[PDB]
Design a binder for these strands. Structure first.
Ligand code: K
Ligand code: K
Ligand code: MG
Ligand code: MG
Ligand code: MG
Ligand code: MG
Lengths: 180, 179
RNA sequence: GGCACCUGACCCCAUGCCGAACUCAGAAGUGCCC
RNA sequence: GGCACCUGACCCCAUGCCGAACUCAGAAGUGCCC
């Protein structure tokens, strides 16, 4: 399972984190835990062929089956208000996560005109990074293009770091193209 | 009574931060769960003493024990695939606190000649294990139902990354370590 | 409003045991998107 | 041999997605019961 971004973590990223913060044992060094990708529908468009087009492209770029999230309790009862399926969700762990981040950061994000870098301030206060991408994402597989149809998918990079400063060191050194 | 929790949140967390210098209160080690594993005594090869034993541990811990059995993978001589080898309960949150309080404010004191706890029983990742062989230390275990169960292997799992931090946690909580 | 984090379980629902997980909850907690 | 930790997985089994959980696996890994 020779993955490019994984290889970089143990080879480069891990040894330098143990320097910046000097961790006692190798198991306290922050790691990547999961990547949750959420492509919402926002009820702005209801066509059924939307959920299925998104469900299938999201599955190719992630290599995993998306789960259909749904509206729990009801809302405004006029007639045309709450559907049922409200978006797609996939949780990437292990190898599929290393492969998705390598394609996202190194081939998809760069092949975008309107891109200067990621906002280094989008950290949740507990070591996790939150991103929102409403552009076209070009992947080796297919092209994720629901720019006009749906809004932006919500990516959450959840790590084992305890603080944001250690979360971005991991991410900075990992490859994430920020602006700081 | 959840008095051991108050102690953690009022005394221990601040004393640990002082000792190790945690910048954030959520990095301070805490108890995640306690797993109890009871071997079988007379409840073994039976289904009436095994019910009085389960309800036995069920009252000691506050929750429904789980029955551990021998993996199902028979060869060619079909004679079943493993019967019950014991009971298991995973204590988290309040039930975990209440059990740790009883354990040291009731169960450990009822032991005669008690030395202390081995300060070495740390698994290397910040967790602690101990075995309470002979009972009569738990008020609940009724008479005429004592040898229904053997001794319990306890595993105190914490969020502490090392034994050092884990030990400080336990010692500040009030575990009577031999040392 | 949604996903992630955080925290809980009154409610649907859930645990070979465990609201750990799954489910649910949360204007006046944190991040991001609309 | 059991539980916990750790690491791993189409072998039974499993995930609204996810070997995260559940299941299973690991003499020559750590801890307590042996
Ligand atoms: K929770
Ligand atoms: K595991
Ligand atoms: Mg984190
Ligand atoms: Mg630990
Ligand atoms: Mg459920
Ligand atoms: Mg299963």
């Amino acid at each position: 399972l020779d993955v490019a971004l994984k290889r970089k973590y143990y080879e480069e990223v891990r040894p330098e984190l143990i320097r910046r913060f000097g961790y006692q044992n190798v198991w306290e060094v922050p790691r990547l835990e999961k990547v949750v990708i959420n492509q919402g529908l926002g009820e702005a468009k209801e066509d059924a062929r939307i959920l299925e087009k998104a469900a299938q492209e999201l599955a190719l770029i992630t290599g995993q089956k998306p789960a259909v999230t749904r509206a729990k309790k009801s809302i405004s009862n006029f007639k045309l208000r709450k559907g049922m399926p409200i978006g797609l969700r996939v949780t990437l762990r292990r190898d599929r996560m290393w492969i998705f981040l390598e394609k996202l950061l190194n081939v998809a994000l760069p092949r975008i005109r309107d891109f200067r870098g990621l906002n280094p301030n989008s950290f949740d206060g507990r070591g996790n990074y939150n991103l929102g991408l409403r552009e076209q994402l070009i992947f080796p597989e297919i092209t994720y293009d629901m720019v006009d149809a749906l809004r932006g998918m919500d990516i959450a990079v959840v790590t084992t770091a305890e603080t944001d400063e250690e979360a971005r060191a991991l991410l900075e050194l990992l490859g994430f193209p920020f602006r700081k």
